[PDB]
Amino acid sequence: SMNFYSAYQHGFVRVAACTHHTTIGDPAANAASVLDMARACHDDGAALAVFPELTLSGYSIEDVLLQDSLLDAVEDALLDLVTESADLLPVLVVGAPLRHRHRIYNTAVVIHRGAVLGVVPKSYLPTYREFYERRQMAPGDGERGTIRIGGADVAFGTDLLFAASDLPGFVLHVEIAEDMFVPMPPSAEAALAGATVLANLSGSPITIGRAEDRRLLARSASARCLAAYVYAAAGEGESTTDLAWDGQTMIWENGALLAESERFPKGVRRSVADVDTELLRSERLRMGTFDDNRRHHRELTESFRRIDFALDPPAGDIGLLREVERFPFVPADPQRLQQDCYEAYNIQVSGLEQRLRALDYPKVVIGVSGGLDSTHALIVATHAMDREGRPRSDILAFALPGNNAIKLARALGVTFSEIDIGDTARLMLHTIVTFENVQAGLRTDYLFRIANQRGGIVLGTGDLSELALGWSTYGVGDQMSHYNVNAGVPKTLIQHLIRWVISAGEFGEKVGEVLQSVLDTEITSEAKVGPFALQDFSLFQVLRYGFRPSKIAFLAWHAWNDAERGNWPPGFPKSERPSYSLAEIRHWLQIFVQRFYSFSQFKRSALPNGPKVSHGGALSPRGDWRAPSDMSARIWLDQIDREVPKG
Amino acid sequence: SMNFYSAYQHGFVRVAACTHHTTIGDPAANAASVLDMARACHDDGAALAVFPELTLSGYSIEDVLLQDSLLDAVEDALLDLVTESADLLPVLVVGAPLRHRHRIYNTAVVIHRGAVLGVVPKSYLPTYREFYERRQMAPGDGERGTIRIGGADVAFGTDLLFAASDLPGFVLHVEIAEDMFVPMPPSAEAALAGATVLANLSGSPITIGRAEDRRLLARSASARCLAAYVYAAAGEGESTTDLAWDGQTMIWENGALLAESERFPKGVRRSVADVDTELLRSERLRMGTFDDNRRHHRELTESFRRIDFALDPPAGDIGLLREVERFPFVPADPQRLQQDCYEAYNIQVSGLEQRLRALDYPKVVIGVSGGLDSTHALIVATHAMDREGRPRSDILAFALPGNNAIKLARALGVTFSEIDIGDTARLMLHTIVTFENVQAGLRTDYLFRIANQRGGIVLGTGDLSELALGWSTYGVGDQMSHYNVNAGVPKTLIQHLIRWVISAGEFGEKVGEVLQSVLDTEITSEAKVGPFALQDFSLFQVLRYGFRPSKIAFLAWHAWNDAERGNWPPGFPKSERPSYSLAEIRHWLQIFVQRFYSFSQFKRSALPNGPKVSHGGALSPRGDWRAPSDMSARIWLDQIDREVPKG
Amino acid sequence: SMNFYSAYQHGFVRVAACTHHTTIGDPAANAASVLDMARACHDDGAALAVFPELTLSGYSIEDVLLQDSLLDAVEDALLDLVTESADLLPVLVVGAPLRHRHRIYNTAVVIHRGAVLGVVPKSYLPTYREFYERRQMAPGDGERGTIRIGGADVAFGTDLLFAASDLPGFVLHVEIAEDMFVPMPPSAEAALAGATVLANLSGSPITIGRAEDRRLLARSASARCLAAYVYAAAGEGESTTDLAWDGQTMIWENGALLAESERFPKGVRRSVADVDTELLRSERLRMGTFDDNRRHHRELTESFRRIDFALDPPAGDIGLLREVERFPFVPADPQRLQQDCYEAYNIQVSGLEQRLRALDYPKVVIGVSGGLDSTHALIVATHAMDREGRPRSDILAFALPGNNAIKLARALGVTFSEIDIGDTARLMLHTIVTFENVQAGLRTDYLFRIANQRGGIVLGTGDLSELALGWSTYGVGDQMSHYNVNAGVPKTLIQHLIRWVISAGEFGEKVGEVLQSVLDTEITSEAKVGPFALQDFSLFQVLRYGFRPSKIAFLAWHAWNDAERGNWPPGFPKSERPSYSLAEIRHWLQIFVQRFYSFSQFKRSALPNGPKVSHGGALSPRGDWRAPSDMSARIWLDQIDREVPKG
């Protein structure tokens, strides 16, 4: 029933930061650039278009700001833009010097569908180094009430929110340039009062290092305020009597850069991106201290004035202007991925180290199959022992048949032994896929018994994705161990941790050759539960954000349906770059929500210790995931039936 | 009279962030680690030592926090540390769960010289994902009054400042972990109330990406709050039942990282750095909107309680724990420098572009000597013309004799002409170092006359360092031009902009060969005014911070006296790495303050347009530097006589 | 499209202060005098008519105020005036004792178009010396709410503003007599709250010195409150049992007297004047501390009640009731002009003195052409040298040919030398109106070279009007000098400074004869840029107030079109009293806005030091005028095309 391909119906809001062509001291010309860009934003289906500080006059005109003809021309141009907006989709946020009471104010005028919703004055006017703003303009901090524009009294002040009544996830707040650089910025109080999209109009003459400063402050605002931050600075056309300009625009969301434009461009530029209002909503739902901070500042935050507007956004397929990683646990960017792998590995190792110290260095018993998970756990166990100054021969590795394993153990210098469970199984199957659980259980039973006998503990090797799907023999089974270093690591990341270890090369070339052989042999269960690439994608969206299934399918389809779009991490030869149809994503998603929400929780409910690894979450019922073991997944399956097309 | 080699006498404060060895549930053991580290901080002359969240109990002990024997043992250990501090220099900030009224609070105890100065509870206790803090502990936001510790009632609450009565630049405020992550952090209000050093005790279980998050928030706090930010997280010893720890510590100052320690270390680590309290003071003096923000929140900021203590810091030579760049305008880090050069060049080019458009593309007249400055200006002029779609033959370059110049002009395809001023000079010297000003003036006179005749403007090529020192023939002279693209660029950066242009290679190999020849010929005036490396060093300290001369000499001596210490930017063969004695630095500094404060302002007072380039400042009297043309430098010279040793 | 001849369309508001004929204790008679005067105000197109304190009863009637028949008769008369006002243009402000709650109040009733807008009680009732007011009447300070008049509840209190909704520059506030004499008058808070026109109804028995006291307080109110102040006192008809009355009325604007009436008149009198609401608006726009004062008293100023009314003023030519000086820099009044010239001369001299001291008394090099500007600068240079005890022979004066100059230098006893640039020019024009810039440049080049050679500085002589219009050879040119004493002095004032110096006679009769010869020869460039009388007129309006071009043309046409109207300063024989048509004023104004806003700023952007002289402004880019060097004057030219008739 929803239009599945509509970004607006999935909770996105399309927003634009625009750098126009400045004609200093010519408001009709600045307005014609603005209108042209605003029409491009309309054609793109954008809900918001933010322009540079003092758009209609030029930022850089100093005492010209005070000339009656300049100020009159700004009013005439502004009113003409307002009439134009009757036919434009986006809210426009346009800068203007405007008269109010005794002075002119440096303002952002918020315009929508033929009306002015509000006028927001800059709160802090720098008057130091290259800035002289208090000479021409009055501070807006603490100003409230209304301003008279074109025959209407409209809201004026630095306490205004603009809330889309048909898009509750979109609540706009506006501030100007210096306002975001002070210790207590107006946007931070507005975020706590309910703003989700924070706009900044900037003039910002460019000097060496200044772009880094803008980025630092806008990025950290977006993170600390669990918000999108939409920034536009002035560019070509501002006076270069004493100053230069780079026209930078950028869009941040919760600390992530969604889009940015060319610095020092020839001609106008825009950043345009779909902000996920549900991502912002999900972060604020979970981070309770955000709301405790609002309650601490209740008087400050409860008094904002909320001005309502109806956006009436396009209902159809307008694409999705957003990078959606195929692997939420495996960043495509190589530098970022190296860092993640470094971090995961040390998490795993230091976790195990603390366990070994607290137990006065037991021997470590571990089942090794030659598979990715147990290969990597053995490497972790080895490094933990090395760092604790303990002999590698205190590692007791067991192959348990019902290849690369013995090679790897021999290359590491750990104690390797191979017990054949075939026979004990047989006497079991007699005294009482059955076949295949008896084996799994007898593996575990043995490992524990040897650990008892040898003064050791059992290290587990099962991974987070297996925990998510309940892929595991419950009880006496592979979940059970004294400490599982892989419990927090999703299957999709495991191969990269191994690659990272090989690249490290800190184990020497023989060990690297065996690990490489493991990767080559294992990479090329997924037949029952489907591709781990898709199941790890849904696990992240559910565990981090609680997104509904149709939202997850939509993100997954944009990431995965076309192998040529987007980016792939390192380690994917062209031939190993699969693409998935919506029918496939839908199928594996029905299996995901059933197994995750309903079937699998009981198996997780009694997990072994092991460290949390991913910022996306782990599944410890002592930690990130508290849930009932006895619930149906009916509503999630029904949501898929209702909202995700069959193909 | 001061001890010139004393970092404390130059306004530094030495601060330490420490990660100790956690013994969970054993306060006597945690306190013994703390005391050992605190004694190391004492030996280092540190004024402050901050430890991880809940130091005395362990952060990670969950319901064990509520056990009477744990809480009793924390009190006994805390009191014993307090008695120990009688003999230690630094203020210690140690975490503890402490009983107050109905509940325990997650606290930082601030300890100095045998007394507890104050107890600061955490304001926001996360209870989401891996955090369960509201289960055991009460929120401290809004709590005031006193807490009873060891027979004394001491200040308790999240409104405390600790001010060193003998070191006014050191005013401490403390917050804990999550407190810095909310939209309106307690430290931001404390900065506005007067805090200059903000401490954070953190537990912070480590996950992929989390260190980047800590960095983002601590760095941007330090920048937006014009403060130092001292952060310590827990490491080895915390429980790894569900979580891992990386022991990270770091020290930020105004957005710059001063120090950080090894992640996931074996054993304890500290970051130790000298914070420049005068840098923080100078930034706050200049950025008036910082204080406007305090006045907006007057009620909030005026009610902090200030607790005084006397530090009585070491008076002798304890070195300087701080990286002091030799070239404040030329970052040693290659990536940072590439960025700076990219930015300067585009500033210069786009500045000139706007001037050319506004004048309907005049011809551009430029004097070319073959020197660094005029070589680079000709490159800028060329690129500006290219970008504006204008013919290079509209550039009119003139050699004016009284080599690489004609080569470069020919290689660029601009119009080159060589006028010999020898003869006109002669008739001048007759009709009325004199010799050598007549020449300089006749150069200018000609250039303007040709510009008039040819429908053009004169581009200036003099640089910022020449403006700073008044190295220039005033009037009809080389200062005068229609637009100076070099006016904002200090001499020390010029050579690197040329190198950057060569590396760009966007002009082709012939032009690159000529530029390289310019560098080789020119690099190897400074005999009258001294080394530009030293004069640019002092210019930055004066223009950005207004530091007194003894402070400038001290920084310069630490940067420059030993060629083997510190880092050099790219482009300095081993043989070109000079070192300077204090006697030399003192000599050039006396010349600097006389020329800068007294002699040179009149020549700057009428400068041509050109863009500001460096975040350090430019010298436009319309911009960064407003000063009288008729003042003595007596007090600065006297300060040198009184406070800088002769050698 | 505007009616150019309409004072209302140019932002004037016509206001009247009226002294009526008092019939003590006869309200019908007082109302008939009021109505007669109000009809005269209507016929004059006045927007406001203010009457004396207690108009309807008589001020002086003491306990008769308390008689029921007196109070009833006041109500009946008041209601009848109110019905009459249905047909009158002006707001009427009429005094009445009115019952409210327990007492009568001394009130001003504000009446407009058939309704009572508000009733304002006197705040402070003097009861000392001849005043007994608290005996009969209650204080109004702090009273709010409404009063019942003629079946309507209307606003009552000392917090009322009356704002013309179709004339935003007209916001009225009313106070009574003693209210303006206390340290914190109600009108001062009303000005900060937005009042631009402050009315005072006064009874004010007249004694020796009292008129001076009224003037002092009303004048300084109008200045400190950047407002018009409209004052009317009672006259004939008040009881002379113990007191006399002088019927004074006056209208002040920003410290200037606009109009006043005959003291002790036989019959009624009115002051009627057009208040420039744009002048008040421009002063408040520029004086930021006025608004800082409002923000300091925010609670006080934000709570005024604003009562709106539509004036619907006459749209046609009603003349202009205002003295508009032909020379904003040259007051017509001889005493005022002598003072201005005394002040300018000492400004110039003391400026130069400080420069000479700071440079340890250099020789002073100056180009002397015999013209007004260089003649006067040489006199200034001479007096500065005399005052500093320095020999006149240290002045080095140069004639530079391409008469009165050598006479004047010889008469002063300075060192005179005549260099002929003819020849050096020639060799210049060869090595490369051109002709005529080469000369100007060679003048400058020489002067600087001689200054270098002789241990001196170059004094500039160019004037403010030349700076305004960019009349000057940029660069090496006549702008350039070490110190310009004329930089702040407009051309129109220069001749009067010379006349003043002659009258002083402090140089002796020979020098006076030469100066007189200079005036006679020079007085009788203006062919390219037009009459300096018109260009200085526009410069003042732009620099002081930022008025739009049509407003400037309107003022200039009223000042200049008829030589017989208005006043001329001293020094204008009948034959030298030009008049200008609107077509001429329009033509020179188009040239003015193009040169001033667009063409000329670059030449000013690098000005030499020199002191600000006129309260109207100077053009130092370090001082009064910060503006871009690269802006178009399109909007000002377009404003002229749209709004100023061709002739």
PDB file of C-alpha atoms in Angstrom, chain C residues 398-474:
ATOM      1  CA  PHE C 398      57.388  73.683  -3.303  1.00  0.00           C
ATOM      2  CA  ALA C 399      55.754  75.183  -6.333  1.00  0.00           C
ATOM      3  CA  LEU C 400      55.746  72.532  -9.080  1.00  0.00           C
ATOM      4  CA  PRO C 401      54.875  73.957 -12.609  1.00  0.00           C
ATOM      5  CA  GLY C 402      53.719  71.883 -15.635  1.00  0.00           C
ATOM      6  CA  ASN C 403      52.003  83.299  -7.955  1.00  0.00           C
ATOM      7  CA  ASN C 404      50.055  83.720  -4.703  1.00  0.00           C
ATOM      8  CA  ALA C 405      52.054  80.679  -3.693  1.00  0.00           C
ATOM      9  CA  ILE C 406      55.417  82.395  -3.649  1.00  0.00           C
ATOM     10  CA  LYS C 407      53.904  85.586  -2.155  1.00  0.00           C
ATOM     11  CA  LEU C 408      52.347  83.586   0.653  1.00  0.00           C
ATOM     12  CA  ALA C 409      55.462  81.512   1.380  1.00  0.00           C
ATOM     13  CA  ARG C 410      57.644  84.635   1.356  1.00  0.00           C
ATOM     14  CA  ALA C 411      55.148  86.454   3.630  1.00  0.00           C
ATOM     15  CA  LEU C 412      55.195  83.509   6.079  1.00  0.00           C
ATOM     16  CA  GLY C 413      58.969  83.159   6.189  1.00  0.00           C
ATOM     17  CA  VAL C 414      58.981  79.448   5.210  1.00  0.00           C
ATOM     18  CA  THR C 415      61.519  77.879   2.826  1.00  0.00           C
ATOM     19  CA  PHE C 416      60.268  78.178  -0.701  1.00  0.00           C
ATOM     20  CA  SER C 417      61.614  76.429  -3.769  1.00  0.00           C
ATOM     21  CA  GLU C 418      60.243  75.967  -7.252  1.00  0.00           C
ATOM     22  CA  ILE C 419      60.908  72.831  -9.149  1.00  0.00           C
ATOM     23  CA  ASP C 420      59.806  72.569 -12.759  1.00  0.00           C
ATOM     24  CA  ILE C 421      58.540  69.070 -13.546  1.00  0.00           C
ATOM     25  CA  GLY C 422      58.045  69.875 -17.251  1.00  0.00           C
ATOM     26  CA  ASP C 423      61.326  68.166 -18.190  1.00  0.00           C
ATOM     27  CA  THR C 424      61.137  64.978 -16.149  1.00  0.00           C
ATOM     28  CA  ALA C 425      57.600  64.452 -17.440  1.00  0.00           C
ATOM     29  CA  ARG C 426      58.840  64.692 -21.021  1.00  0.00           C
ATOM     30  CA  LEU C 427      61.461  61.901 -20.494  1.00  0.00           C
ATOM     31  CA  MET C 428      58.654  59.885 -18.815  1.00  0.00           C
ATOM     32  CA  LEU C 429      56.058  60.261 -21.631  1.00  0.00           C
ATOM     33  CA  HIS C 430      58.827  58.977 -23.925  1.00  0.00           C
ATOM     34  CA  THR C 431      60.233  56.032 -22.026  1.00  0.00           C
ATOM     35  CA  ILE C 432      56.724  54.590 -21.991  1.00  0.00           C
ATOM     36  CA  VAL C 433      45.109  63.249 -19.983  1.00  0.00           C
ATOM     37  CA  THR C 434      47.874  60.662 -19.785  1.00  0.00           C
ATOM     38  CA  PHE C 435      50.130  63.704 -20.053  1.00  0.00           C
ATOM     39  CA  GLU C 436      48.250  65.134 -17.058  1.00  0.00           C
ATOM     40  CA  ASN C 437      48.557  62.104 -14.723  1.00  0.00           C
ATOM     41  CA  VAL C 438      52.278  61.772 -15.410  1.00  0.00           C
ATOM     42  CA  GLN C 439      52.570  65.281 -14.056  1.00  0.00           C
ATOM     43  CA  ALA C 440      50.486  64.624 -10.951  1.00  0.00           C
ATOM     44  CA  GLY C 441      52.541  61.503 -10.232  1.00  0.00           C
ATOM     45  CA  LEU C 442      55.885  63.199 -10.760  1.00  0.00           C
ATOM     46  CA  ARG C 443      54.821  65.880  -8.322  1.00  0.00           C
ATOM     47  CA  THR C 444      54.234  63.240  -5.686  1.00  0.00           C
ATOM     48  CA  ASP C 445      57.315  61.214  -6.585  1.00  0.00           C
ATOM     49  CA  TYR C 446      59.521  64.312  -6.149  1.00  0.00           C
ATOM     50  CA  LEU C 447      57.914  65.453  -2.922  1.00  0.00           C
ATOM     51  CA  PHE C 448      58.541  62.023  -1.379  1.00  0.00           C
ATOM     52  CA  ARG C 449      62.065  61.937  -2.698  1.00  0.00           C
ATOM     53  CA  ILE C 450      62.906  65.380  -1.261  1.00  0.00           C
ATOM     54  CA  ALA C 451      61.240  64.394   2.034  1.00  0.00           C
ATOM     55  CA  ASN C 452      63.527  61.289   2.112  1.00  0.00           C
ATOM     56  CA  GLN C 453      66.562  63.378   1.285  1.00  0.00           C
ATOM     57  CA  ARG C 454      65.841  66.231   3.660  1.00  0.00           C
ATOM     58  CA  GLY C 455      64.683  64.218   6.683  1.00  0.00           C
ATOM     59  CA  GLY C 456      61.053  65.294   6.341  1.00  0.00           C
ATOM     60  CA  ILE C 457      57.516  64.152   5.719  1.00  0.00           C
ATOM     61  CA  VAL C 458      55.038  65.074   2.977  1.00  0.00           C
ATOM     62  CA  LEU C 459      51.903  66.900   4.051  1.00  0.00           C
ATOM     63  CA  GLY C 460      48.857  66.266   1.886  1.00  0.00           C
ATOM     64  CA  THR C 461      46.396  69.002   0.984  1.00  0.00           C
ATOM     65  CA  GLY C 462      43.518  67.209  -0.747  1.00  0.00           C
ATOM     66  CA  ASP C 463      40.094  67.749   0.783  1.00  0.00           C
ATOM     67  CA  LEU C 464      37.155  65.609   1.853  1.00  0.00           C
ATOM     68  CA  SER C 465      35.004  66.405  -1.192  1.00  0.00           C
ATOM     69  CA  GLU C 466      37.794  65.256  -3.468  1.00  0.00           C
ATOM     70  CA  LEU C 467      37.950  62.015  -1.447  1.00  0.00           C
ATOM     71  CA  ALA C 468      34.179  61.612  -1.751  1.00  0.00           C
ATOM     72  CA  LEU C 469      34.164  61.886  -5.524  1.00  0.00           C
ATOM     73  CA  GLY C 470      37.494  60.142  -6.282  1.00  0.00           C
ATOM     74  CA  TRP C 471      38.816  63.385  -7.830  1.00  0.00           C
ATOM     75  CA  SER C 472      42.487  62.466  -7.626  1.00  0.00           C
ATOM     76  CA  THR C 473      45.166  60.478  -9.453  1.00  0.00           C
ATOM     77  CA  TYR C 474      45.329  57.167  -7.590  1.00  0.00           C
TER      78      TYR C 474
END
